[PDB]
Amino acid sequence: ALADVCRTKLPSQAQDTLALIAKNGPYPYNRDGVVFENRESRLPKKGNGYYHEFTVVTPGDRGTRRVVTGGYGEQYWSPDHYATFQEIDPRC
Numbered sequence: 001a002l003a004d005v006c007r008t009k010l011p012s013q014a015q016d017t018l019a020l021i022a023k024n025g026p027y028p029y030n031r032d033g034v035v036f037e038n039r040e041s042r043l044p045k046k047g048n049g050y051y052h053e054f055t056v057v058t059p060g061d062r063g064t065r066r067v068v069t070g071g072y073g074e075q076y077w078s079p080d081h082y083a084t085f086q087e088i089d090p091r092c
């Protein structure tokens, strides 16, 4: 019971990040690709190192917008530094 969001409906910058992830970078930030530990269990509970985070650029500081990836290619959107998540639907 996480909400879905269509990939094509995400901010352009979020879609940019999904494209860089698919290309394995090079990434704009040093912390791109760091483990996300899911300490609040907002994403499905998995083993250590399952999730990683990547910055979604904000025009005008690094900012709060992120994509989180899972180990089998799951993709999640969070505009607010992991306060909230939506599962990215790659089909729309």
Ligand SMILES: OC[C@H]1O[C@@H](O)[C@H](O)[C@@H](O)[C@@H]1O
Residues within 6 Å of the ligand: 028, 029, 030, 031, 032, 062
């Ligand atoms: O992620 C840590 C740092 O990565 C660097 O590549 C960026 O230039 C910084 O703006 C960023 O804060």
